[PDB]
mmCIF file of C-alpha atoms in Angstrom:
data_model
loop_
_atom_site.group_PDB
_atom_site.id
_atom_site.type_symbol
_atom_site.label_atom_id
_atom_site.label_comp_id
_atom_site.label_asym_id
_atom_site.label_seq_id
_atom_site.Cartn_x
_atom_site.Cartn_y
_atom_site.Cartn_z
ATOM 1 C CA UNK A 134 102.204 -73.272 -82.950
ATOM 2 C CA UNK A 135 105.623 -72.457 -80.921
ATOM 3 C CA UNK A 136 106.886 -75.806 -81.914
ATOM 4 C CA UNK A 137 106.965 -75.192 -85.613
ATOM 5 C CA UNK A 138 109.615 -72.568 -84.770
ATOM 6 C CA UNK A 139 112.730 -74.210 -84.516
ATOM 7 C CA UNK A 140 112.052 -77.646 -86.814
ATOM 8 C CA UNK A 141 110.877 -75.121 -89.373
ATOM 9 C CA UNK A 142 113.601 -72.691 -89.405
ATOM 10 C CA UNK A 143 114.838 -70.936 -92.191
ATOM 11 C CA UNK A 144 118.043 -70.776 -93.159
ATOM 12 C CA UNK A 145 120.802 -68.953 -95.585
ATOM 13 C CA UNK A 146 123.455 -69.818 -98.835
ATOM 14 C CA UNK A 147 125.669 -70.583 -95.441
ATOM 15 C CA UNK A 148 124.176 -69.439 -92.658
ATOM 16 C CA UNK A 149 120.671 -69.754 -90.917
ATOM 17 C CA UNK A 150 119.011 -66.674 -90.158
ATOM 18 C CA UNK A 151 115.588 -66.095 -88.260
ATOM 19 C CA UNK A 152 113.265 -62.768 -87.836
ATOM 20 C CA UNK A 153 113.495 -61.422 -84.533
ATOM 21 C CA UNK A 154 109.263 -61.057 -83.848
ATOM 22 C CA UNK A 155 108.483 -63.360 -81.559
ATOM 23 C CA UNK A 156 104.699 -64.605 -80.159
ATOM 24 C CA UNK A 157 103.268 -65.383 -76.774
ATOM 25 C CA UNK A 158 103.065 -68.845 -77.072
ATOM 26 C CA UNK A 159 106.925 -69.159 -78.438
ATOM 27 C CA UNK A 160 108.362 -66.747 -75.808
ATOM 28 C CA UNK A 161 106.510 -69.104 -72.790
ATOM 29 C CA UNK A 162 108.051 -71.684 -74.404
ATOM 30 C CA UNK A 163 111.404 -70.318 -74.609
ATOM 31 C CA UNK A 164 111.088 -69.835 -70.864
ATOM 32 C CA UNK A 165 109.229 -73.262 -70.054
ATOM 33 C CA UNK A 166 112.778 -74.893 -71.527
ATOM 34 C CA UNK A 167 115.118 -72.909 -69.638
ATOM 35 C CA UNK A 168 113.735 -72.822 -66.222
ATOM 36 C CA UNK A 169 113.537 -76.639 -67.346
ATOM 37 C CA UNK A 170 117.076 -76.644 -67.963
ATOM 38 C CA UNK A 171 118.295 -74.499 -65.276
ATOM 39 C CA UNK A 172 116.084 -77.073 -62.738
ATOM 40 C CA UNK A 173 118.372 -80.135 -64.895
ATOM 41 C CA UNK A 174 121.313 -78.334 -64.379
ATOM 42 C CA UNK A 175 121.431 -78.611 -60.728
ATOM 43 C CA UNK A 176 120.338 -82.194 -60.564
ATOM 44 C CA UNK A 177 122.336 -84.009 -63.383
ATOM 45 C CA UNK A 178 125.890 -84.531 -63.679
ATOM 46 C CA UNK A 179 125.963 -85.681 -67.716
ATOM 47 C CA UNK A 180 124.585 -83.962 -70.108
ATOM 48 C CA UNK A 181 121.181 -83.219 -68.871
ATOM 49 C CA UNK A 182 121.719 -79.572 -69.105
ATOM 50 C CA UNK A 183 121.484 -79.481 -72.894
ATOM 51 C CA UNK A 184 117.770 -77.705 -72.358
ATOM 52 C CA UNK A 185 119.607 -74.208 -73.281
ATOM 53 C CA UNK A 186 121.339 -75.416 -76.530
ATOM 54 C CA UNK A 187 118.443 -74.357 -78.817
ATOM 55 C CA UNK A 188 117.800 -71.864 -77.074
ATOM 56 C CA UNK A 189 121.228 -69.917 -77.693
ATOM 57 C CA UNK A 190 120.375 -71.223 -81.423
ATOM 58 C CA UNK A 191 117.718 -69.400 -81.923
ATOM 59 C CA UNK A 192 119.342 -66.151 -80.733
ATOM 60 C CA UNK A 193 122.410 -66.691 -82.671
ATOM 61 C CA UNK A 194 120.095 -67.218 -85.804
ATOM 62 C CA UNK A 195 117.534 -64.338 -85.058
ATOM 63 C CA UNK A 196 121.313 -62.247 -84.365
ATOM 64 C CA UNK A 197 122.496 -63.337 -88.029
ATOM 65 C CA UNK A 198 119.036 -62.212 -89.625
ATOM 66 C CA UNK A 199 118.893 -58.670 -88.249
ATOM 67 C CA UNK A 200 122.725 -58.603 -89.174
ATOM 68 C CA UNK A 201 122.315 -59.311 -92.666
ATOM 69 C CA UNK A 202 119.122 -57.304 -92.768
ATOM 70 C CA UNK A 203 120.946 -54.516 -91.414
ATOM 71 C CA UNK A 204 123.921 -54.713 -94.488
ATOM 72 C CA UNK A 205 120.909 -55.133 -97.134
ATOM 73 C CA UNK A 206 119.690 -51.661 -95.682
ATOM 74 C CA UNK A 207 123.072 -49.672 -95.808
ATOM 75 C CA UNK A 208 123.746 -51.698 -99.021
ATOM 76 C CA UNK A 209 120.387 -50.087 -100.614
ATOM 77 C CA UNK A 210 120.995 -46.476 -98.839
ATOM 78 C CA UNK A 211 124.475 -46.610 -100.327
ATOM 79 C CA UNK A 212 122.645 -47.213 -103.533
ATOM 80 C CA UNK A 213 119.774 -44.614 -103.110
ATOM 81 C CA UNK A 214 122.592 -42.421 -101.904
ATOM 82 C CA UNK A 215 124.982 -42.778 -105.123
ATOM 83 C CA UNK A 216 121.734 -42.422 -107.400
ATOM 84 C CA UNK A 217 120.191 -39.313 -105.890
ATOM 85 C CA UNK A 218 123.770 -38.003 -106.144
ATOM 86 C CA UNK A 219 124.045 -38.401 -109.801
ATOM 87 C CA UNK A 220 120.208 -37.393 -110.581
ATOM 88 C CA UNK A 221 120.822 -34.900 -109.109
ATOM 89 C CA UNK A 222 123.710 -33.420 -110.785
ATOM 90 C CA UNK A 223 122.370 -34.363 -114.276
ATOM 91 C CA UNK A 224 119.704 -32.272 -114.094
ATOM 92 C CA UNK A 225 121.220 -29.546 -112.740
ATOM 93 C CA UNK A 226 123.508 -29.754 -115.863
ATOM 94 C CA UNK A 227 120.768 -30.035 -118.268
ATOM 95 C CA UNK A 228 118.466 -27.178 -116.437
ATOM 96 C CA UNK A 229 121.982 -25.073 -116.368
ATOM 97 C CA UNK A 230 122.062 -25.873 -119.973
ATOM 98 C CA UNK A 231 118.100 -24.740 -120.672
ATOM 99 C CA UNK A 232 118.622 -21.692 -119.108
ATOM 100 C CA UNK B 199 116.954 -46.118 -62.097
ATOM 101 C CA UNK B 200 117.216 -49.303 -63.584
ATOM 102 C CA UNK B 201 114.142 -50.406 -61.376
ATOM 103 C CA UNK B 202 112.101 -48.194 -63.764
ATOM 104 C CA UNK B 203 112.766 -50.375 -66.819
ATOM 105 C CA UNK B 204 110.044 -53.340 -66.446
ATOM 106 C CA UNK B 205 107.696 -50.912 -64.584
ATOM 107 C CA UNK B 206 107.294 -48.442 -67.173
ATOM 108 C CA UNK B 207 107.855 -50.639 -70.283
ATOM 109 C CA UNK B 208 106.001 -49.213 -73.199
ATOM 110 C CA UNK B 209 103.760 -51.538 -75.473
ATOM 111 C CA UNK B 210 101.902 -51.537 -78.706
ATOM 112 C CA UNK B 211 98.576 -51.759 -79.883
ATOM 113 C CA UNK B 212 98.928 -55.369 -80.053
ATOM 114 C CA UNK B 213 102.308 -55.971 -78.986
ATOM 115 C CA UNK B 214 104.997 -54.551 -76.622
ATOM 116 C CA UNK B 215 108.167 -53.347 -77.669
ATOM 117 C CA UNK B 216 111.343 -52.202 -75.733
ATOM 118 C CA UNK B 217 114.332 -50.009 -77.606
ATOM 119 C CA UNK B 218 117.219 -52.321 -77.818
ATOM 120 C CA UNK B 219 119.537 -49.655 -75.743
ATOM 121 C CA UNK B 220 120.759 -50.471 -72.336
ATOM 122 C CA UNK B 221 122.486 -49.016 -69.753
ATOM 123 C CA UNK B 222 125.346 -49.936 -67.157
ATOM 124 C CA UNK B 223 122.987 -50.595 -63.889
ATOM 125 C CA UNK B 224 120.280 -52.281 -66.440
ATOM 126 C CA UNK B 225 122.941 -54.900 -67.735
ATOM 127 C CA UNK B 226 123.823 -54.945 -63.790
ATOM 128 C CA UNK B 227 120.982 -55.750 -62.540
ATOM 129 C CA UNK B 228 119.929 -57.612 -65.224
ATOM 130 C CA UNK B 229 123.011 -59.896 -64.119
ATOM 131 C CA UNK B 230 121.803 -59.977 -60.430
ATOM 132 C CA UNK B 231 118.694 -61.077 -61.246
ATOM 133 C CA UNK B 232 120.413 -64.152 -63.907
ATOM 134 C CA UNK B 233 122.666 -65.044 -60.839
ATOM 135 C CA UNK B 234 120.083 -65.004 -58.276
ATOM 136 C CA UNK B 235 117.859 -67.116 -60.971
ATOM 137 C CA UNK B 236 120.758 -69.648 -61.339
ATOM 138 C CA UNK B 237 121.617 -70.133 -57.584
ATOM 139 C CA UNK B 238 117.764 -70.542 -56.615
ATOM 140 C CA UNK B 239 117.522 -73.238 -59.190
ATOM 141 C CA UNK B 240 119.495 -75.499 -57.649
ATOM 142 C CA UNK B 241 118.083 -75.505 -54.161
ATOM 143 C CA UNK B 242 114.490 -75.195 -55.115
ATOM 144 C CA UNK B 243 112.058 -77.281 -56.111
ATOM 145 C CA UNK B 244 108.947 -75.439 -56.845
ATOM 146 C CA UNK B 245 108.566 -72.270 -58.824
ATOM 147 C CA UNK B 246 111.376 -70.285 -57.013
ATOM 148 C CA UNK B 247 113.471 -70.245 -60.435
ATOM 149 C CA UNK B 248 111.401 -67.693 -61.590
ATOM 150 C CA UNK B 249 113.547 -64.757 -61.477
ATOM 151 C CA UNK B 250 114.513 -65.365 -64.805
ATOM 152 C CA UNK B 251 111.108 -64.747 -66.368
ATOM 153 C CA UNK B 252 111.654 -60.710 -66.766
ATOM 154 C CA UNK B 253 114.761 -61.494 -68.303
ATOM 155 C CA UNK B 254 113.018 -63.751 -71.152
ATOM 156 C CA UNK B 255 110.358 -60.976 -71.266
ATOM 157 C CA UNK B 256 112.794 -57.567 -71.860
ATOM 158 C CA UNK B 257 114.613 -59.509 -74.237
ATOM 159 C CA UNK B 258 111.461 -60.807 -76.304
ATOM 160 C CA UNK B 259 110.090 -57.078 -76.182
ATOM 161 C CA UNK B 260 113.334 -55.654 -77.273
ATOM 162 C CA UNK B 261 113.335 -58.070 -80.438
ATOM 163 C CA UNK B 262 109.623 -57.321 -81.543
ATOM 164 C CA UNK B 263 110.882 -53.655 -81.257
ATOM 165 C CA UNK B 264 113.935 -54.503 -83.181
ATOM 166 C CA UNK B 265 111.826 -56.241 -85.996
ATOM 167 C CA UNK B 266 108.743 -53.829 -85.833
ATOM 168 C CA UNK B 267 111.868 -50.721 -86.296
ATOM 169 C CA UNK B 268 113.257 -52.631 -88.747
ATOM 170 C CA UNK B 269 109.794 -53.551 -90.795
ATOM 171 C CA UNK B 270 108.944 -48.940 -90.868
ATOM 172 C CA UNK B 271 112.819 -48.379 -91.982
ATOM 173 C CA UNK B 272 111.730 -51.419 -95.220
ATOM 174 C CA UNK B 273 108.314 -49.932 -95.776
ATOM 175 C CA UNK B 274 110.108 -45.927 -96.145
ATOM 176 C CA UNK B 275 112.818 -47.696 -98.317
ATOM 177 C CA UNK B 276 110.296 -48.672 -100.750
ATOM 178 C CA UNK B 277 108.639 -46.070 -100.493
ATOM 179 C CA UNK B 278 111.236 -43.506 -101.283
ATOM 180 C CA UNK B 279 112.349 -45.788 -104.143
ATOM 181 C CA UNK B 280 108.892 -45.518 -105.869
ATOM 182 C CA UNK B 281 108.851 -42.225 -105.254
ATOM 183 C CA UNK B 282 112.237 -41.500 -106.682
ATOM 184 C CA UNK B 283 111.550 -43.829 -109.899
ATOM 185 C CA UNK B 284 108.526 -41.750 -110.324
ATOM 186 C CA UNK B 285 109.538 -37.991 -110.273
ATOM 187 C CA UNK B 286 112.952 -39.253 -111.974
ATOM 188 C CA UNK B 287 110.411 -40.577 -114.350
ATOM 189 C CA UNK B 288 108.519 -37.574 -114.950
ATOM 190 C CA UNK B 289 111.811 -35.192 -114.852
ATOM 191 C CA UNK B 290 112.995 -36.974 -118.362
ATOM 192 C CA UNK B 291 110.176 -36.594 -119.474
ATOM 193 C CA UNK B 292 109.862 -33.161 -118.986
ATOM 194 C CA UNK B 293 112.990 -32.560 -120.077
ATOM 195 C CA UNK B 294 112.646 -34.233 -123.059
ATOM 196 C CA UNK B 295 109.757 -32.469 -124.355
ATOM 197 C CA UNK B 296 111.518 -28.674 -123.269
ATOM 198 C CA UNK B 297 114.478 -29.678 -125.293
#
């Protein structure tokens, strides 16, 4: 159901993130309220044209996520990276040693 | 040939999926197509606002491509940190017992 999506959103310590894989039904929806909105926005003066709101929320959250899931990648090749380093160089002291 | 974007999109075996790189004519014509969208909007009443429904679609495909990229770089994380526990594992071991 597309309209669990945004009443059901996750969120973060002090942020709100969101995974970028969308569906069929949630992306028709996503256009359903803008071409809604953009209809609104030529016909109302107040503010009738408030159809886009969630929908710039939802990118800015779905943004954040593969942001912060980008930094928990580097953070872990960084650490991979550091390891393998030192692994490595241990055993090539204790093999130089062996021999 | 920006024209040769929506044409020749590439899918998946269930999905479709779009690389999230762009190009100077795409993001121009991609803001043609948003301006020509908004403008018809207001001085149409049926379904001439749909210009903006390729728009919606690229950018959904580019986010399941995004997230489905994202998902293969997680899976060979963990897998090359398994693998790494293991045959660092195995190296003490083997070490152990030679000295």
């Amino acid at each position: 159901i597309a309209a669990r999506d945004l009443i059901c959103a996750q969120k973060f310590n002090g942020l709100t993130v969101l995974p970028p894989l969308l569906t069929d039904e949630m992306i028709a929806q996503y256009t359903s309220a803008l071409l809604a909105g953009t209809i609104t926005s030529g016909w109302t003066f107040g503010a009738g044209a408030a159809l886009q709101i969630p929908f710039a929320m939802q990118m800015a959250y779905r943004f954040n996520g593969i942001g912060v899931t980008q930094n928990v990648l580097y953070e872990n090749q960084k650490l991979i990276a550091n390891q393998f380093n030192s692994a490595i160089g241990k055993i090539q002291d204790s093999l130089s040693s062996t021999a």
